[PDB]
Coordinates of C-alpha atoms and ligand atoms in Angstrom, one line a residue:
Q1 CA 119.2 110.4 81.7
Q2 CA 122.0 108.3 80.2
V3 CA 123.3 104.9 81.1
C4 CA 126.6 104.1 82.9
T5 CA 127.8 100.7 83.9
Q6 CA 130.1 101.4 86.8
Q7 CA 127.8 98.7 88.3
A8 CA 125.8 96.1 86.4
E9 CA 122.0 96.3 86.4
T10 CA 120.5 92.9 87.2
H11 CA 116.8 92.9 88.0
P12 CA 115.8 90.4 90.7
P13 CA 113.5 87.7 89.3
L14 CA 110.0 87.6 90.7
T15 CA 107.4 85.0 89.7
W16 CA 103.7 85.8 89.5
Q17 CA 100.6 83.9 88.4
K18 CA 98.3 84.7 85.5
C19 CA 94.8 83.2 86.1
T20 CA 91.9 82.2 83.9
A21 CA 88.6 80.3 84.2
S22 CA 90.4 77.0 83.8
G23 CA 93.5 77.6 86.0
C24 CA 96.4 79.8 87.0
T25 CA 99.8 79.7 85.2
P26 CA 103.2 80.9 86.5
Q27 CA 104.8 83.8 84.8
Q28 CA 108.5 85.0 84.5
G29 CA 109.0 88.5 85.8
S30 CA 111.5 90.8 87.5
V31 CA 111.5 94.0 89.6
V32 CA 113.3 97.3 88.8
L33 CA 114.4 100.0 91.3
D34 CA 113.2 103.6 90.9
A35 CA 115.6 106.0 89.2
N36 CA 115.7 108.3 92.2
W37 CA 117.4 105.8 94.4
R38 CA 120.2 105.3 91.9
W39 CA 123.6 107.0 91.7
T40 CA 123.4 109.8 89.2
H41 CA 126.8 110.9 87.9
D42 CA 128.9 112.1 85.0
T43 CA 128.8 110.0 81.8
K44 CA 132.6 110.3 81.5
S45 CA 133.7 110.2 85.2
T46 CA 132.7 109.5 88.8
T47 CA 131.7 113.1 89.4
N48 CA 128.3 113.3 91.1
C49 CA 125.5 115.1 89.2
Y50 CA 123.4 114.9 92.4
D51 CA 124.9 114.5 95.8
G52 CA 123.0 115.0 99.1
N53 CA 120.1 117.3 98.1
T54 CA 122.1 119.6 95.8
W55 CA 122.6 119.3 92.1
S56 CA 125.9 119.7 90.1
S57 CA 126.4 123.3 89.0
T58 CA 128.7 122.4 86.1
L59 CA 127.1 119.2 84.9
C60 CA 123.5 120.3 85.4
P61 CA 123.1 124.0 84.5
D62 CA 119.7 123.5 83.0
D63 CA 117.2 120.6 82.8
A64 CA 118.1 119.6 79.2
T65 CA 121.9 119.8 79.5
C66 CA 122.0 117.8 82.6
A67 CA 120.2 114.8 81.0
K68 CA 122.9 114.9 78.3
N69 CA 125.7 115.0 80.8
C70 CA 124.5 112.6 83.5
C71 CA 123.9 108.9 83.7
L72 CA 122.0 106.3 85.8
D73 CA 123.9 103.4 87.3
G74 CA 123.3 99.8 88.3
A75 CA 121.9 99.1 91.8
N76 CA 123.0 96.6 94.4
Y77 CA 119.5 95.5 95.3
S78 CA 120.4 93.4 98.3
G79 CA 123.6 95.1 99.5
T80 CA 122.6 98.8 99.2
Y81 CA 118.8 98.9 99.0
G82 CA 117.9 95.7 100.9
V83 CA 115.7 94.2 98.1
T84 CA 115.5 90.4 97.7
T85 CA 113.3 88.1 95.8
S86 CA 112.8 84.4 96.4
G87 CA 110.3 82.7 94.0
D88 CA 107.0 84.2 95.0
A89 CA 108.3 86.5 97.7
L90 CA 109.6 90.0 97.3
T91 CA 111.1 91.3 100.5
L92 CA 111.7 95.0 101.1
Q93 CA 113.9 96.2 104.0
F94 CA 113.1 99.6 105.5
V95 CA 116.7 100.6 106.5
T96 CA 120.0 99.5 105.0
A97 CA 123.3 101.2 105.7
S98 CA 123.2 104.6 103.9
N99 CA 119.7 104.0 102.6
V100 CA 116.0 104.2 103.5
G101 CA 113.0 102.7 101.7
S102 CA 112.5 101.6 98.1
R103 CA 110.1 101.7 95.1
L104 CA 110.0 98.9 92.5
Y105 CA 108.1 98.1 89.4
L106 CA 107.1 94.7 87.9
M107 CA 108.6 94.1 84.5
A108 CA 107.5 92.0 81.4
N109 CA 111.1 92.1 80.3
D110 CA 114.2 94.2 81.0
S111 CA 113.2 96.8 78.5
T112 CA 109.5 97.1 79.3
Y113 CA 107.3 97.4 82.4
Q114 CA 104.5 94.9 82.9
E115 CA 101.2 96.7 82.1
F116 CA 98.0 95.5 83.7
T117 CA 94.4 96.1 82.5
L118 CA 92.3 96.1 85.7
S119 CA 89.0 96.6 84.0
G120 CA 87.0 93.3 84.3
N121 CA 89.9 91.7 86.1
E122 CA 90.9 91.1 89.7
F123 CA 94.3 91.4 91.5
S124 CA 95.4 89.1 94.4
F125 CA 98.4 89.1 96.6
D126 CA 99.7 87.8 100.0
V127 CA 101.4 90.3 102.3
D128 CA 103.3 90.2 105.6
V129 CA 102.8 93.5 107.5
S130 CA 103.9 92.1 110.9
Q131 CA 107.1 94.1 111.0
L132 CA 105.5 97.4 109.9
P133 CA 104.9 99.7 112.9
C134 CA 103.4 103.2 113.0
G135 CA 104.9 105.7 110.5
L136 CA 105.7 103.1 107.8
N137 CA 103.8 102.2 104.7
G138 CA 104.0 98.9 102.8
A139 CA 102.4 100.1 99.6
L140 CA 101.2 98.1 96.6
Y141 CA 99.5 100.2 93.9
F142 CA 99.0 100.7 90.1
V143 CA 100.0 103.9 88.2
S144 CA 99.5 104.9 84.6
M145 CA 103.2 104.8 83.7
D146 CA 104.7 104.6 80.2
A147 CA 105.7 100.9 79.4
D148 CA 109.1 102.0 78.2
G149 CA 109.6 104.7 80.7
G150 CA 108.9 107.4 78.1
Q151 CA 111.8 106.6 75.7
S152 CA 109.5 106.9 72.7
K153 CA 108.1 110.3 73.6
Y154 CA 111.3 111.8 75.1
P155 CA 114.7 111.2 73.3
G156 CA 116.5 112.7 76.3
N157 CA 115.8 109.4 78.1
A158 CA 118.3 106.7 77.2
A159 CA 117.7 104.7 80.4
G160 CA 114.1 103.7 80.0
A161 CA 112.3 101.1 82.0
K162 CA 115.6 99.2 82.4
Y163 CA 116.6 101.7 85.1
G164 CA 113.2 102.6 86.6
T165 CA 112.5 105.9 84.8
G166 CA 109.2 107.7 84.2
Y167 CA 107.4 107.3 87.5
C168 CA 104.1 109.2 87.9
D169 CA 101.3 109.5 90.4
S170 CA 98.2 111.5 91.5
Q171 CA 100.3 113.6 93.9
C172 CA 102.2 114.9 90.9
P173 CA 105.5 114.6 92.7
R174 CA 108.1 117.4 92.1
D175 CA 110.7 115.4 94.1
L176 CA 111.7 113.4 91.0
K177 CA 115.2 114.0 89.7
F178 CA 114.4 113.1 86.1
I179 CA 111.1 113.8 84.3
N180 CA 110.4 113.3 80.6
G181 CA 114.1 112.8 79.7
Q182 CA 115.0 115.9 81.5
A183 CA 116.5 116.8 84.9
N184 CA 114.7 118.7 87.6
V185 CA 117.6 121.0 88.7
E186 CA 115.7 124.1 87.7
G187 CA 114.0 125.6 90.7
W188 CA 115.3 122.8 92.9
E189 CA 114.8 123.5 96.7
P190 CA 116.6 121.2 99.1
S191 CA 114.5 119.5 101.7
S192 CA 114.7 121.0 105.2
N193 CA 114.3 117.7 107.1
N194 CA 115.7 115.3 104.5
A195 CA 119.4 115.3 103.5
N196 CA 118.7 113.2 100.4
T197 CA 115.6 114.7 98.8
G198 CA 114.3 118.0 97.4
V199 CA 111.6 119.8 95.4
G200 CA 112.1 120.7 91.8
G201 CA 110.3 122.9 89.3
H202 CA 108.5 120.2 87.4
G203 CA 106.6 117.1 88.4
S204 CA 104.8 114.0 86.9
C205 CA 101.1 113.2 86.9
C206 CA 99.1 110.1 86.1
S207 CA 96.1 108.1 87.4
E208 CA 96.8 106.2 90.6
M209 CA 95.0 103.2 92.1
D210 CA 96.2 102.5 95.6
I211 CA 95.3 98.8 96.2
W212 CA 97.4 98.6 99.4
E213 CA 98.4 101.4 101.7
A214 CA 99.1 99.7 105.0
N215 CA 101.0 98.8 108.1
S216 CA 100.2 96.6 111.1
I217 CA 97.8 99.2 112.4
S218 CA 95.7 100.3 109.4
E219 CA 95.0 99.6 105.7
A220 CA 93.5 101.8 103.0
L221 CA 92.1 101.3 99.5
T222 CA 92.1 104.5 97.5
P223 CA 91.4 105.4 93.8
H224 CA 92.8 108.6 92.5
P225 CA 91.5 110.3 89.3
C226 CA 93.5 112.6 87.0
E227 CA 92.1 114.9 84.3
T228 CA 94.7 113.4 82.0
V229 CA 94.7 109.6 82.4
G230 CA 98.3 109.2 81.0
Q231 CA 101.6 110.7 82.0
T232 CA 101.9 114.5 81.8
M233 CA 104.6 117.0 82.9
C234 CA 103.5 119.6 85.5
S235 CA 105.0 123.0 86.1
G236 CA 105.5 124.6 89.5
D237 CA 102.4 125.0 91.7
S238 CA 100.2 124.0 88.8
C239 CA 100.8 120.3 89.4
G240 CA 99.5 120.4 92.9
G241 CA 100.1 117.7 95.4
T242 CA 101.4 117.6 99.0
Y243 CA 104.4 119.8 98.3
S244 CA 103.0 123.0 96.8
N245 CA 101.3 126.2 97.9
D246 CA 98.0 124.7 96.7
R247 CA 97.1 121.1 97.1
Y248 CA 94.0 121.1 94.9
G249 CA 95.4 123.2 92.0
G250 CA 96.7 120.3 89.9
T251 CA 95.1 118.1 87.2
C252 CA 95.0 115.2 89.7
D253 CA 93.3 114.2 92.9
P254 CA 95.8 113.9 95.9
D255 CA 93.2 112.9 98.5
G256 CA 91.2 110.2 96.6
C257 CA 88.3 108.0 97.5
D258 CA 89.6 105.9 100.4
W259 CA 88.1 102.9 102.1
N260 CA 89.6 102.5 105.6
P261 CA 87.7 100.0 107.8
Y262 CA 89.0 101.8 110.9
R263 CA 88.1 105.2 109.6
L264 CA 84.6 104.1 108.6
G265 CA 83.7 102.8 112.0
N266 CA 85.1 99.3 112.5
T267 CA 88.1 99.4 114.8
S268 CA 88.4 95.6 115.4
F269 CA 88.8 94.3 111.9
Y270 CA 92.4 95.0 111.1
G271 CA 95.3 95.0 113.6
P272 CA 97.8 93.1 115.7
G273 CA 96.6 90.3 117.9
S274 CA 93.9 87.6 118.0
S275 CA 91.2 90.3 118.8
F276 CA 91.1 91.6 115.3
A277 CA 89.4 89.7 112.5
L278 CA 92.6 90.1 110.5
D279 CA 95.6 89.5 112.7
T280 CA 98.5 91.5 111.2
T281 CA 101.1 89.5 113.1
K282 CA 100.2 86.8 110.6
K283 CA 100.2 87.1 106.8
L284 CA 97.0 87.6 104.8
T285 CA 95.7 87.4 101.3
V286 CA 94.2 90.6 99.8
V287 CA 92.0 90.3 96.7
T288 CA 90.8 93.4 94.8
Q289 CA 88.1 93.1 92.1
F290 CA 87.5 95.7 89.5
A291 CA 84.2 95.8 87.7
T292 CA 83.7 97.3 84.2
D293 CA 81.7 100.1 85.8
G294 CA 84.7 101.0 88.0
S295 CA 83.2 99.6 91.2
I296 CA 85.8 98.0 93.5
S297 CA 85.1 94.8 95.4
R298 CA 87.3 93.3 98.1
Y299 CA 87.7 90.2 100.2
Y300 CA 90.5 88.9 102.5
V301 CA 91.8 85.4 103.2
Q302 CA 93.6 84.6 106.5
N303 CA 94.3 81.0 107.6
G304 CA 91.7 79.7 105.2
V305 CA 88.9 82.1 106.4
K306 CA 87.4 84.4 103.8
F307 CA 86.6 87.9 105.1
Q308 CA 84.3 90.2 103.1
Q309 CA 84.9 94.0 103.3
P310 CA 83.0 95.2 106.4
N311 CA 79.7 97.0 105.6
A312 CA 80.0 100.7 106.4
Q313 CA 77.3 103.4 107.1
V314 CA 78.4 106.7 105.6
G315 CA 75.4 109.0 105.6
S316 CA 72.7 107.4 103.5
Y317 CA 75.1 104.9 101.9
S318 CA 75.2 101.3 103.1
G319 CA 77.5 98.7 101.5
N320 CA 81.0 97.3 101.1
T321 CA 82.1 98.3 97.7
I322 CA 83.7 101.5 96.3
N323 CA 81.4 103.3 94.0
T324 CA 80.1 106.8 93.0
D325 CA 77.5 106.5 95.8
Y326 CA 80.0 105.8 98.5
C327 CA 82.6 108.3 97.2
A328 CA 80.0 111.1 97.1
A329 CA 78.7 110.1 100.6
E330 CA 82.2 110.1 102.0
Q331 CA 82.8 113.5 100.6
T332 CA 79.7 114.9 102.2
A333 CA 80.2 113.2 105.6
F334 CA 84.0 113.8 106.1
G335 CA 84.6 116.8 103.9
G336 CA 86.5 117.6 100.7
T337 CA 85.4 117.4 97.1
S338 CA 88.7 116.7 95.3
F339 CA 87.7 113.2 94.1
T340 CA 84.6 114.2 92.1
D341 CA 86.2 117.4 90.9
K342 CA 88.7 115.4 88.8
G343 CA 86.0 113.2 87.3
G344 CA 85.5 110.7 90.1
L345 CA 85.0 107.0 89.5
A346 CA 84.1 107.5 85.9
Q347 CA 87.4 109.2 85.2
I348 CA 89.6 106.7 86.9
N349 CA 87.7 103.9 85.2
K350 CA 89.5 105.1 82.1
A351 CA 92.7 104.1 83.9
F352 CA 91.4 100.6 84.6
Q353 CA 90.6 100.2 80.9
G354 CA 94.2 101.3 80.0
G355 CA 97.5 99.9 81.1
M356 CA 98.9 100.4 84.6
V357 CA 102.3 99.4 86.1
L358 CA 102.4 97.5 89.3
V359 CA 104.3 99.3 92.1
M360 CA 105.6 97.8 95.3
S361 CA 107.2 100.1 97.9
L362 CA 108.1 100.7 101.5
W363 CA 108.4 104.2 102.9
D364 CA 107.9 106.7 105.7
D365 CA 106.2 110.1 105.5
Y366 CA 108.5 113.1 105.7
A367 CA 105.6 115.5 105.3
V368 CA 102.7 114.3 107.5
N369 CA 104.3 111.4 109.5
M370 CA 101.8 109.0 108.1
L371 CA 99.1 110.3 110.4
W372 CA 96.7 110.3 107.5
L373 CA 96.9 106.5 107.4
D374 CA 97.2 105.3 111.0
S375 CA 96.3 108.2 113.3
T376 CA 94.0 111.2 113.8
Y377 CA 94.3 113.6 110.9
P378 CA 94.5 116.5 110.4
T379 CA 96.0 118.1 113.5
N380 CA 93.3 120.8 113.3
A381 CA 90.6 118.1 113.7
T382 CA 89.5 116.5 117.0
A383 CA 88.9 112.8 117.7
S384 CA 85.2 113.8 117.5
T385 CA 85.6 115.1 114.0
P386 CA 84.0 112.7 111.5
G387 CA 86.5 110.6 109.7
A388 CA 89.4 112.1 111.6
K389 CA 90.5 108.9 113.4
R390 CA 92.0 106.5 110.9
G391 CA 94.1 104.3 113.2
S392 CA 95.1 103.8 116.8
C393 CA 98.5 105.3 116.8
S394 CA 99.7 108.5 118.6
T395 CA 99.8 111.9 116.9
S396 CA 103.5 112.0 117.8
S397 CA 104.2 108.7 116.1
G398 CA 105.6 108.5 112.5
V399 CA 108.5 110.9 112.8
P400 CA 110.9 109.6 110.0
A401 CA 114.1 110.1 111.9
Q402 CA 112.6 108.5 115.0
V403 CA 111.2 105.4 113.2
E404 CA 114.4 104.9 111.2
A405 CA 116.4 104.7 114.4
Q406 CA 113.8 102.8 116.3
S407 CA 112.8 100.2 113.7
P408 CA 115.5 100.0 111.0
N409 CA 114.9 96.3 110.5
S410 CA 111.2 96.8 109.5
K411 CA 110.2 94.8 106.4
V412 CA 107.3 94.1 104.1
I413 CA 107.0 90.8 102.1
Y414 CA 104.9 90.7 98.9
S415 CA 104.2 87.2 97.7
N416 CA 101.7 85.0 95.7
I417 CA 100.7 87.6 93.1
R418 CA 97.8 86.6 90.9
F419 CA 96.1 88.4 88.0
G420 CA 93.1 87.4 85.9
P421 CA 89.3 87.8 85.4
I422 CA 86.9 88.3 88.3
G423 CA 86.6 85.0 90.2
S424 CA 89.7 83.3 88.7
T425 CA 92.5 84.1 91.2
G426 CA 91.1 82.0 94.1
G427 CA 91.7 78.5 93.0
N428 CA 91.8 77.4 89.3
Ligands
NAG1 C1 108.8 92.7 76.3 O1 107.5 92.9 76.8 C2 106.4 93.2 75.9 C3 105.1 93.0 76.6 O2 105.2 91.8 77.2 C4 106.5 92.4 74.6 O3 105.6 92.8 73.7 C5 107.9 92.4 73.9 O4 107.9 91.5 72.9 C6 108.9 92.0 74.9 N1 110.3 92.3 74.4 C7 111.3 91.4 74.4 C8 111.0 90.1 75.0 O5 112.4 91.6 73.8
NAG2 C1 83.8 94.9 112.5 O1 84.6 93.7 112.3 C2 84.1 92.5 111.9 C3 84.1 92.3 110.3 O2 83.9 91.0 110.0 C4 82.6 92.2 112.3 O3 82.5 90.9 112.9 C5 82.2 93.2 113.4 O4 80.9 93.0 113.8 C6 82.4 94.6 112.9 N1 82.0 95.6 114.0 C7 81.3 96.7 113.8 C8 80.7 96.9 112.4 O5 81.0 97.5 114.7
NAG3 C1 92.5 122.4 108.7 O1 93.7 121.9 108.2 C2 93.9 122.0 106.8 C3 95.3 121.4 106.4 O2 95.3 120.0 106.4 C4 93.7 123.4 106.3 O3 93.9 123.5 104.9 C5 92.3 123.9 106.7 O4 92.1 125.2 106.2 C6 92.3 123.9 108.2 N1 91.2 124.6 108.8 C7 89.9 124.2 108.9 C8 89.0 125.3 109.5 O5 89.5 123.1 108.7

């Protein structure tokens, strides 16, 4: 995709902390909006290359020609997309006039994403999920994205990280408008329940580490392994993911190894009100520790009180950390084998040892209604079915067009981001 300047591109500044054994030091940073939310149009005019959920027939005949004829434009972060930063805080608004949701990446500079090496290090952040009802997701995660957005590998990309290009995940999303310096007009199917999205022929795969998938009702910690650690282009049903005839035909794991305190047995640990150990009406600190083995440790901090991850009994397993033993026990108890099929913890440990881009987003589910996070899932399973109940929300809740009209002023606030070796983020 090319670059147009019908509107200037200014990344909202966000400060984070880099920690070491002797202290934590402030770092200058900024966030960039994903390329899919941007206005794609002709390089020489105001003619849309993509309007609604249908591509331009004259400007985008094929994938390669479209990228030559079309440009990405600057984004009004506050006015159009409702994204504001104030020192430590990054605030994302669910609904803005003519817009829903957002996805942003932390940057080292304007030209490059900020790459994190999780192996041997820990990640800490404060989050406000009080305004996040059922059907929404305040997501904070890491993905194996190219630091430059793929400008080095693909010459068709002239935008780069400066305009939020080159997104990848384990779902291998085919909904991306631009992949590898090429458009996705070929084989593009408009969405039936979304007047702004669609499904193309190609997709984008990379290792995904979901540190935070949460609302006021439930929170989940999920590692996703891919056969290819870095970014690769997928083709058709081969990529897999939620939107394909086959979900487990890709090179990646869509399901993942997930740790949901509610799903594992504890229904009074995370929720709204004094009753829960972690009151979601109030903000909390979430610390995620990554060992060199790939094992994932976790503790929370709310109002000065440290909460260890609650011990869960899954089959023969007993503990509070994500490891091969738990991930195998969860697969046997609840069902599915997708995590270990793509290499498991040993495969995604390669992603921890490599660079991954920090992603902070707010979105609703147009496919499942977020029932996989905060409700009983799937529909074909009963409340009695092991690992079916993941939250306390209704099976009717989460409908995108319902929650957009009901709670348009929903928001998630990410603040106090710290990164450093294990045991360094807490104080000094
Ligand atoms: C931007 O970021 C990368 C990694 O921090 C750095 O190596 C590079 O020098 C920076 N480029 C600039 C500041 O122009
Ligand atoms: C779940 O929540 C908290 C975690 O600290 C704990 O006090 C409580 O005993 C747990 N309940 C269970 C395991 O049933
Ligand atoms: C249950 O639902 C899933 C879709 O999420 C489907 O693939 C599966 O075949 C269904 N049937 C059974 C018997 O579990």
